Design a protein around this nucleic acid. Structure first.
Ligand SMILES: [Mg+2]
Ligand SMILES: [Mg+2]
Ligand SMILES: [Mg+2]
Ligand SMILES: [Mg+2]
Ligand SMILES: [Mg+2]
Ligand SMILES: [Mg+2]
Ligand SMILES: [Mg+2]
Ligand SMILES: [Mg+2]
Ligand SMILES: [Mg+2]
Ligand SMILES: [Mg+2]
Ligand SMILES: [Mg+2]
Ligand SMILES: [Mg+2]
Ligand SMILES: [Mg+2]
Ligand SMILES: [Mg+2]
Ligand SMILES: [Mg+2]
Ligand SMILES: [Mg+2]
Ligand SMILES: [Mg+2]
Ligand SMILES: [Mg+2]
Ligand SMILES: [Mg+2]
Ligand SMILES: [Mg+2]
Ligand SMILES: [Mg+2]
Ligand SMILES: [Mg+2]
Ligand SMILES: [Mg+2]
Ligand SMILES: [Mg+2]
Ligand SMILES: [Mg+2]
Ligand SMILES: [Mg+2]
Ligand SMILES: [Mg+2]
Ligand SMILES: [Mg+2]
Ligand SMILES: [Mg+2]
Ligand SMILES: [Mg+2]
Ligand SMILES: [Mg+2]
Ligand SMILES: [Mg+2]
Ligand SMILES: [Mg+2]
Ligand SMILES: [Mg+2]
Ligand SMILES: [Mg+2]
Ligand SMILES: [Mg+2]
Ligand SMILES: [Mg+2]
Ligand SMILES: [Mg+2]
Ligand SMILES: [Mg+2]
Ligand SMILES: [Mg+2]
Ligand SMILES: [Mg+2]
Ligand SMILES: [Mg+2]
Ligand SMILES: [Mg+2]
Ligand SMILES: [Mg+2]
Ligand SMILES: [Mg+2]
Ligand SMILES: [Mg+2]
Ligand SMILES: [Mg+2]
Ligand SMILES: [Mg+2]
Ligand SMILES: [Mg+2]
Ligand SMILES: [Mg+2]
Ligand SMILES: [Mg+2]
Ligand SMILES: [Mg+2]
Ligand SMILES: [Mg+2]
Lengths: 85, 200, 113
RNA sequence: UGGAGAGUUUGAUCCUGGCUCAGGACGAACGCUGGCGGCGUGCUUAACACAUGCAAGUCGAACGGAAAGGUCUCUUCGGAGAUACUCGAGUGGCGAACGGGUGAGUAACACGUGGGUGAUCUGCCCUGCACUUCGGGAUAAGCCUGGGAAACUGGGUCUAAUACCGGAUAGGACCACGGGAUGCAUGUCUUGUGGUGGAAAGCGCUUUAGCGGUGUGGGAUGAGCCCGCGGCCUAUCAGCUUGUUGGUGGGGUGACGGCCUACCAAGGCGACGACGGGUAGCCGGCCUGAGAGGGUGUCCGGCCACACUGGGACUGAGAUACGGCCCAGACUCCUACGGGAGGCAGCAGUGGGGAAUAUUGCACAAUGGGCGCAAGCCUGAUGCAGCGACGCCGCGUGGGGGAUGACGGCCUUCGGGUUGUAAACCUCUUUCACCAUCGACGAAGGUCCGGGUUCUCUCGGAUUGACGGUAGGUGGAGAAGAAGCACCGGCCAACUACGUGCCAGCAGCCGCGGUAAUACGUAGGGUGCGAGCGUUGUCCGGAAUUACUGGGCGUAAAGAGCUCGUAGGUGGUUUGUCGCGUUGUUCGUGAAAUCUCACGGCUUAACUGUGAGCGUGCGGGCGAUACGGGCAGACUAGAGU
């Protein structure tokens, strides 16, 4: 890079990439553990991992990681995947 | 630009006394050149060209400038030959001529060109300044007590003042009541042949 | 943001300006959203007109004037009546009416006769 | 309110019918020539390769700090203390997605116009509302060291924050059940109970300086996606299509959706031109034309697409990410051979290609933009200047008298004629350039110093303009410094002489020249035009020679060898209805510039500003039913039995 403020911003992009990669990857495991609970047919852990997965999706939406409309799509899918059981 | 040449030679060819009065013309009222005595061929294009060549060297207007006068004369409502000379009579050096502040058409142009006239207290030096209704055309302060201007004070009788302008006394300032319509134009040219020239 | 700005649209040495409710992400002579006045800084006072009931619309909804337009809205009293300042009257001055084309022409008749 | 023709088929004529010319225009080039000013405008070819400088930063009123400047003090005669105005490097915030450039790609929802979004997003700005609360661990910088030729990079200690991380409460996050409004099928908005949940940040003050933080109701702006209709050539391209076309369950996205996936169903497109080939950015507009049309997309303005070629993402409200990242490829340069760096289709500029297109200019004064409380800093955007008659417009190169019509020139029926009032001479006026001299409007602003509390505001001053000692004003000397170019057989304005003899050569047409050439070369004269004039190229006109306006087919080019028949086009008489075609009105839109009309400002004009038209169309409301059509009938004359 050539402009002084683009060497400065190439470093601040790489921190925010490593920050957002770790937060998004935590949501894929917390969705998965609900999927492996609801597909087994427990209704015990899945009703108390629904409260904890949806609570992480809202916190990533306030940290500027996913969008507020994306949190509202994944929470409504998993809450409707509890009432099937 | 300007022609700046023999003024009789381009009045012999058109067969019409353009400048007012000539003794060089009417001694040879036939067209110039070494073949100046033979008869001409009656073409329809010649009678429309040499009618437009009248209007240029009468007023000292060039072809690229005279053509623009046609382009708005044909565009104003009314007629076309009427409004061609209407926007041609209102040139400032023509107003100085008809007011009698000169003798010929060329000397009425240098008096406008060399800065001897204001209009509304505005120092003009353009010959093609089209005056309008109510335009006073005054004269400069330095222009008085000068030889070619006070020659135009005792010679205020030999040519009439047209009905559309009006000259006043010891303050030589020319007042314009309205634009000239048709009848108070001096007519050496017919007007329905310049109109038929540019339609070719 | 929404910027009320000036737009250069005269000759080379004669900058006739307009007053245009434009966007900040826009060049000068782009699409205005509503042209609400003109400003001619070559006359002897100057020539200033603001619509004064549409400039009250854009100020009441969030337009930000640029710094020479902020001077002009204080002159025509449209800035003061939006805020609540005491100077709600117009401190704008217009040029003096010159004697017209007909009245000077008739007066030159009676001066010679 | 606006329409012109002429030459050439024949011994002659009238037709048909080509070809050719007279007009206008240009981002032009070329030839000859060249005075000035105003105002526009200038790589059309190689989206070819690029040396050098510049084109995006800012904030100490977010934070730790002290390399530079300035001080208080202290010491040495050149060392200290960040605490102290200020500030290199560094962390953090916002900007860097705008602004500028280019037209390679795209026949497409890319663009134009009109609608949809009950299928969406929207930083900074405005406004209504609640809130700003507990804590926690690090690292850049610093310092000490390791690796590397460089570009850069490892490790240990150490310091913050509005950087980062974890809790509390806070409805427009979600699930289930309701109520009340609505409609256009999914539904949408407003509410209620119950169950789960989601925020933040402080800094500064000559003490009412002041700036901020988060979550939400609503506006404003910008954007996404989808649809009707419209704008090229080709059938010597007629079968294309399998995530293709539709459904369900999930995934996905800001959002609907085969966008993705699994299974099921067998579709979808096409002679109203699908699939394919060729070419092309589109539009406002521009040039032409009486108009209808035809050609075009250059300056300026809107939109799209791309940034050395191909692909991919990250950050973020927002990404084709020109002056970011990663990878592969081609080409240039460095190397210690292990490895590294680079992208002018930004502004000037260089090479190359070409018939052809400019300065390595000045300045933030103005307007626009970025950050900052602000002062300011940044801005090759921009405002202007340089060069080229490149175009348009304006003005000069003298004027008033003046025959002895002088010399000279050419022609001469040898008498004269003509250049020619043109020169000579006399006389007058200085526009432009020239010399000297005063010298701006663009600046009711941008800053400092006083009354004003604050915001605001004059009474009122200092200084502040790149253009520029310019534009313009005043004064001086003298006609003084300044004209060309093509054409002259007809079309087509305008003719004689001599030289040359089918030679030299001319020409757009068809023709000219073979010993008296108005057609070739010179001279005199003429004519058109004028700082320009001619040629070449390209486009429209004339061309009613693609004919809607506005043509034809026995013999001139032109009726299929004849019938039957599918799609299509068109339809007798008459009653009722619908109101799609048609038509009236009204509202919304048809951006600004351009164009026409009316006036105003530049000394006029070009140029420019303002008002009204134009914007042929399209969308919503409300009228009309004569005609065309739809629907429900009737009749018998066409047609058939
Ligand atoms: Mg920074
Ligand atoms: Mg994992
Ligand atoms: Mg979903
Ligand atoms: Mg001219
Ligand atoms: Mg024949
Ligand atoms: Mg013949
Ligand atoms: Mg030339
Ligand atoms: Mg030359
Ligand atoms: Mg120029
Ligand atoms: Mg190019
Ligand atoms: Mg290149
Ligand atoms: Mg610093
Ligand atoms: Mg800030
Ligand atoms: Mg960009
Ligand atoms: Mg270009
Ligand atoms: Mg610490
Ligand atoms: Mg909570
Ligand atoms: Mg917290
Ligand atoms: Mg499948
Ligand atoms: Mg679905
Ligand atoms: Mg599906
Ligand atoms: Mg192309
Ligand atoms: Mg025609
Ligand atoms: Mg363009
Ligand atoms: Mg993102
Ligand atoms: Mg960038
Ligand atoms: Mg670049
Ligand atoms: Mg360049
Ligand atoms: Mg070359
Ligand atoms: Mg500036
Ligand atoms: Mg500024
Ligand atoms: Mg010039
Ligand atoms: Mg003078
Ligand atoms: Mg002739
Ligand atoms: Mg001879
Ligand atoms: Mg000859
Ligand atoms: Mg030609
Ligand atoms: Mg033609
Ligand atoms: Mg035609
Ligand atoms: Mg015919
Ligand atoms: Mg027939
Ligand atoms: Mg025959
Ligand atoms: Mg035949
Ligand atoms: Mg037959
Ligand atoms: Mg049929
Ligand atoms: Mg039918
Ligand atoms: Mg019928
Ligand atoms: Mg006008
Ligand atoms: Mg005027
Ligand atoms: Mg105009
Ligand atoms: Mg318009
Ligand atoms: Mg209607
Ligand atoms: Mg019968």
């Amino acid at each position: 890079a050539n402009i002084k403020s683009q060497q400065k911003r190439n470093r601040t992009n790489e921190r925010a990439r490593l920050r957002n990669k770790a937060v998004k990857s935590s949501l894929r495991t917390a969705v998965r553990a609900f999927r492996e609970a609801a597909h087994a047919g427990d209704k015990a852990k899945a009703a108390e991992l629904l409260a904890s997965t949806n609570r992480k999706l809202d916190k990533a939406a306030s940290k500027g990681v996913i969008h507020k409309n994306q949190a509202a799509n994944k929470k409504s899918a998993l809450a409707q995947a509890l009432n099937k059981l | 630009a300007r022609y700046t040449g023999p003024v009789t030679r381009k009045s012999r060819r058109l067969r019409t006394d353009l400048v007012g009065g000539d003794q060089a013309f009417e001694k040879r009222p036939y067209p110039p050149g070494q073949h100046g005595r033979a008869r001409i061929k009656e073409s329809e294009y010649l009678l429309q060209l040499q009618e437009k060549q009248k209007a240029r060297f009468t007023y000292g207007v060039m072809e690229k400038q005279f053509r623009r006068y046609y382009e708005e004369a044909v565009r104003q409502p009314g007629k076309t030959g009427e409004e061609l000379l209407k926007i041609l009579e209102s040139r400032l050096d023509n107003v100085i001529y008809r007011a009698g502040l000169a003798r010929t058409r060329r000397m009425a142009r240098q008096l406008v060109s060399h800065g001897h006239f204001n209009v509304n207290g505005v120092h003009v030096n353009v010959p093609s300044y089209r005056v309008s209704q109510y335009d006073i055309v005054d004269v400069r302060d330095k222009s008085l007590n000068t030889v070619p201007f006070q020659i135009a004070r005792e010679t205020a009788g030999e040519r009439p003042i047209p009905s559309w302008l009006q000259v006043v006394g010891e303050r030589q300032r020319v007042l314009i009541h309205q634009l000239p319509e048709r009848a108070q134009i001096d007519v050496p040219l017919t007007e329905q042949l310049i109109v038929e020239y540019y339609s070719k | 943001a929404v910027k009320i700005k000036l737009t250069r649209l005269g000759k080379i040495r004669n900058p006739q300006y307009r007053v245009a409710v434009a966007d900040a992400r826009t060049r000068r002579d782009g699409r205005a959203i509503e042209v609400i006045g003109r400003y001619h800084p070559k006359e002897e006072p100057s020539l200033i007109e603001i619509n004064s009931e549409r400039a009250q619309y854009w100020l009441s909804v969030g337009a930000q004037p640029t710094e020479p337009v902020l001077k002009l809205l204080k002159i025509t009293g449209d800035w003061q009546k939006f805020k609540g300042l005491p100077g709600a009257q117009g401190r704008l001055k217009v040029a003096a009416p010159k004697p017209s084309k007909l009245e000077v022409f008739n007066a030159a008749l009676a001066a010679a006769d």
